[PDB]
């Protein structure tokens, strides 16, 4: 919640939030990160590694189109 408030202060001063409006953000963020890791794990396995690397993350985002 604090993080969202801080990064929202950059677009409009003195805002107010809804609890569900923050809950939806949390759900979407967790889903996005889970999907990102699900793809990154495949990248790392394709690299014949167990440990997961930031180059794997970057490859996942590049191929996905981000």
């Amino acid at each position: 919640q604090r993080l969202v408030r801080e990064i929202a202060q950059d677009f409009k001063t003195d805002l107010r939030f809804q609890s569900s409006a923050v809950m939806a953000l949390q759900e979407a963020s967790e889903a996005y990160l889970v999907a990102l890791f699900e793809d990154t794990n495949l990248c790392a396995i394709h690299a014949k590694r167990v440990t997961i690397m930031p180059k794997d993350i970057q490859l996942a985002r590049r191929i996905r189109g981000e």
């Binding site: 939806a24 759900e27 979407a28 889903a31 889970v34 699900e38 794990n41 396995i45 167990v50």
Partner: protein, 103 residues
């Protein structure tokens, strides 16, 4: 009598008619469009609820939960294709472990 009773459906035809006439889609609507669309929606709803109920019975429960909806949707070949870009809240993921990680 209600148009739904004539058509033998369960979803209300008249509200669909109003939404079509209200949502700025075209200049006119034919009489059969809302009945057809209601039949389609009823079929899809029944399919989803059937698979959800099966998933719910598979875990010894009597109330359908979003986890059950998630399992029902993701454990089907075509519903996953239809809802591939949809995130369900409080849904979770499918349990699976890659075969190169198990000892």
């Amino acid at each position: 009598k209600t148009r739904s009773s004539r058509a033998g459906l369960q979803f209300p035809v008249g509200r669909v008619h109003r939404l079509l006439r209200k949502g700025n889609y075209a200049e006119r609507v034919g009489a059969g469009a809302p009945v057809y669309l209601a039949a389609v929606l009823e079929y899809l709803t029944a399919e989803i609820l059937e698979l959800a109920g099966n998933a719910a019975r598979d875990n010894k429960k009597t109330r359908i939960i979003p986890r059950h909806l998630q399992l029902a949707v993701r454990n089907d070949e075509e519903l996953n294709k239809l809802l591939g870009r949809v995130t369900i809240a409080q849904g979770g993921v499918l349990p699976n472990i890659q075969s190169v990680l198990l000892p």
